[PDB]
Point group: D2
Chain length 301, copies 4
């Protein structure tokens, strides 16, 4: 129940020198508490985790935990390129009393299911009294979570479910059907939020949620109320905002941090290289998207 609803992915908050900002993180966590979201997914790829050091990630979760404790549920993504660094973040995260721990599969190399199962179980062993969520992200990490690797992962009692980042909503259905009522599948594709929710995803973690959290909460209220016409209107509004945010030269998360600077006065810094920075030409796209968010809120809330 504590994992059901809208859990935005937590962005990377930098200072003007390109280093993790404790004030920025505490600031962005106060924003999510204020917006009334269910939880926060920390140090995921939307949090620029691929580009952070082990110490950078410890500082983010530490500062999220100063603000978020009995108000938001926190999922801490702890996977690293190494099993060793991943175990260190898993220990650390359990040390700060986190709700769940998450892990993408091993990266760059396409390892067998036994190595993937060993990687995830080794991370789960480093935080043995906390919930664990596995992934299905074939498009970035290579291959999709099979039902055989998932059966193997359900042998670990800490596994509470899957973050389904693949595009077929059938994957959600198949994992939910195979796992049953004691597991949860989180909808990954923000653009298919309503579709992944109706077919079986009781959870939803997304990288665009932070830009317009009230829209996803309203969309979720319509889904739970069963008004699919009002839900479909909000989904379409969210999707055109995403497509506008993706039309910039600069990275989507650079666009989102500039939207939050306009709409909320939050200073989250820039995006870490190699993510492309915003250019002068993107500011009109950044202003247009920020206004589309304000307009959607007035129309649907």
């Amino acid at each position: 129940e504590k994992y059901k609803g809208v859990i935005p992915a937590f962005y990377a908050c930098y200072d003007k020198e390109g280093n993790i900002s404790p004030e920025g993180v505490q600031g962005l966590t106060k924003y999510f508490v204020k917006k009334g979201v269910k939880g926060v997914y920390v140090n995921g790829s939307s949090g620029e985790c691929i580009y952070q050091s082990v110490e950078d990630r410890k500082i983010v979760l530490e500062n999220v935990m100063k603000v978020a404790e009995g108000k938001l549920t926190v999922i801490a993504h702890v996977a690293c390129n190494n099993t060793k660094d991943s175990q260190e973040l898993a220990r650390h995260a359990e040390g700060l009393g986190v709700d769940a721990i998450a892990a993408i599969p091993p990266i760059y190399f396409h390892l067998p299911e036994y190595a993937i199962a060993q990687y995830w179980n080794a991370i789960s062993a480093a935080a043995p009294n906390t919930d664990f969520v596995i992934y299905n992200i074939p498009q970035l990490a290579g291959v999709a979570l099979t039902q055989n690797l998932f059966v193997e992962m359900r042998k670990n009692p800490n596994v509470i479910g899957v973050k389904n980042s693949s595009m077929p909503v059938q994957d959600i259905q198949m994992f939910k059907q195979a796992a049953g009522a004691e597991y949860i599948i989180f909808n990954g594709p923000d653009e298919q939020f309503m579709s992944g929710r109706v077919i079986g995803a009781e959870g939803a973690i997304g990288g665009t949620y932070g830009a317009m959290p009230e829209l996803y909460l309203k969309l979720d209220e319509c889904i739970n109320a069963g008004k699919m016409t009002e839900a479909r209107k909000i989904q379409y509004a969210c999707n055109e905002i995403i497509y506008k945010m993706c039309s910039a030269h600069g990275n989507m998360y650079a666009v989102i941090k500039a939207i939050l600077k306009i709409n909320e006065g939050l200073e989250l810094g820039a995006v870490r290289e190699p993510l492309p920075a915003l250019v002068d030409e993107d500011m009109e796209i950044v202003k247009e998207a920020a206004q589309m968010i304000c307009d959607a809120k007035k129309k649907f809330l």
Copy 2:
């Protein structure tokens, strides 16, 4: 409105000699009229169109039209490997007073968008007073319908919409949003029926619908009524039946024709080679699926 709802794909009906059965087609069309489905999608890939001659396909539509006229809406899939053969089926289909005409993209070779646009427009020109539905089937025909090829196709006024066979429900959303209220997107993936319907597909054409039409009609009644829990229960029941039907050595359509022989006494013949025939070992799978259909009907209807 005449295209909205459940439109099953019409199966290939053979005699015991492996030739098209007029009695079998008329028989299977009386079955769909009786079950109260919105329409019938004739000579699509579920109708073994890849394996039929031009004359075989004319005989099927002729016999569907003897039974179906003012009771079912009929979409006739007329694409062939050639533009020439495709135009012949398009003429013929307009000759028999068909509702719409459909066409997969060119096959085997990956042709440019201009050749695909020319192929589809040439077929549309051969039946110039009938509705035309284009495809998005990247997984079989090679590449996905782009928004640029779709913009080009909307210049033809006979184009009423798209049959979306790709897996992302985002594709439905994007095509519906780009096209607007004067176009329809038909949900292709049977396993995501409820998800593709809520996000924007007002139509639904599927190859498994014929095996359990009352389940898809009930599922659609729940979707239209907004009861997503009862819809999700029917979707899961349909999906486990599909997964059982796909677990046979013989082809799914061979399994379905044997299920319809058990549950309805319909004799639709076998599947045309190279489609794999059922083996002795598949009969227990065929009996188990037929019983799962009977059980689903009693539970949800």
Copy 3:
């Protein structure tokens, strides 16, 4: 030995009405005999086989056989969408005394290996005293020829080898190593001719060979002589000609038939729709490629 060397794919020869030209076929076969190539691969995809009727294909092979008998070795590609039509071409081709028969896998649907093995064996049974060539063309027909399927097909004694259309030259190496000296692997990718020939392909069948057969014969003479610098110079010359021929709006085979009209006075007609026709703007590309062929011949022969 009769299959070793340069075997160009035989083009579709039409009259001005878009129907198969007996005079055109006999004409194009006299061209290949004159150029001293090892054989001719008839009714393959470069021969527009996907777009020909069963009777169209019988007329082509009949007319190739009037000219080619004891001078060229003939491989007749007999696969059709159906097993039935494929068997008819296999019978017919054996009736005319061809050297080998070839077959792409089943297309559009992704069938299991047993259905593919049954399709190919059924075609091989229709011509039981003639050599049979299987394919590996993952990029068009879906999935690559696995070693398992290849082991299964080596149980049929008529199987003489594989036409390798995939891009990895490792595939040639792996099939040659697994099969041994009693089988032949034909190099498919014209642009990697020299690379597939050195790693194990003793055969070579290509769609661009007909445009400049003397260049591939010279390239092969260098490969057999072990002069890799002169071979690499010819390969690069052939590859820039191919890239120029592919830069047209009209299909490559439309470009090639127009080059053969300029350089040889051969009238092979146009390309069958949906293959895109040449436009006025392509004639400069067609003239430039024809001159690059003339220039390559003078430089390397």
Copy 4:
């Protein structure tokens, strides 16, 4: 000329505690000097670079440079998940006087060509008086090096060429043809060594070279001498050894470190997790491969 020939990828040398072994690195570098290879490719993916910290990689190159100076040419792979960490390794490597610096594209996220060009140019700027090698590795890093991106990177005068890890040998041909005589393309796929070397790769960097360097040097001597039959015999021998090394449960590099322990008495440690360790059942595969290497050497040297 200093980059032409056999450049093995340098393995990760650990102590029994799983930390970088200075003695192990110096030891493995003395091995390559002794075997008479052209150079050594340090901290590439075969060097477990994805799993090393910035300080781990500095220690490896430092210890390679104590042994290798005027005897081997050194290519130091400096890419990291961050641009920042990558620049640090680029500075460091230039500080130790390496011949060239190499960089895979940005990983996990699929960034635009401008971000990839910026990432590589930023790394090249951190070592501005040293040669730079770009990659084409679509299978692991997502998308292939386009000609457009390659044209952009040739604007940087430090770019000396491409390490081609894709499977089509046409890619080598196309990059060599476009770039000309002032650039070099290194053959990536060890299994296609002879095929990439004949079509235009004057360089060759591989992960299996370290297990049998004398075989690749002999294979290269045959290629340069133009004896394609003796080259093809060595290629086939190398390829069956690779396929045996890949048949283990444990990772290929774990297999190779155990082969070097048997055949050379080198102690390179194990593979860093998540790379799967060898199991008891793999020792027979490890012994069989080591013997196949000894047998190949006696047959071809």
